[PDB]
Amino acid sequence: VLAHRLAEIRKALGHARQADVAALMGVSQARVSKLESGDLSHTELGTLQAYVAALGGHLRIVAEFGENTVELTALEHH
Amino acid sequence: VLAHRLAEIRKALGHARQADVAALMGVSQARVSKLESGDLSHTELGTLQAYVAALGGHLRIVAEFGENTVELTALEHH
DNA sequence: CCACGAGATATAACCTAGAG
């Protein structure tokens, strides 16, 4: 219900395998480890979205400001 | 509670300039454009997290999976 | 399930002006 590691949520999201979350994302199993090994801060949110999407949840990017908040609603990968 | 361009949220705050953000970001006031002229999807989760901090905001990334959600928290200086 | 080697383009970056 709070995590620093993408792999750690996949384990929380049933028996999701690294080669299955690879398969739906149209890329290698290699790429996917290099993903959850990667610094998130040095992940493009697209490449992040693509993943959480791959586990069948939707990535909600809020920019808070004391009251005025801003939800970030941008899609369309290459 | 907007949803579109980064410039939009700056604009949306006090009439802050991409100059004195750039400053609080310590990069050119060029980049800051190339940021808001960019495709979010192809931007580093921190790039944003940085921009949004600079506007006195707190970037909040959730990956919600129906009933439960996972707030992403990965913070240790580059 | 990670490294081992291999290799794109473009993200993140500069400064110096040029369009709005």
Add this chain to the structure above:
DNA sequence: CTCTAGGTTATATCTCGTGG
């Protein structure tokens, strides 16, 4: 007076195979 847009350089993010 503010942003976009030349003109350049590059570190690593994003890709891949196959084999620790």
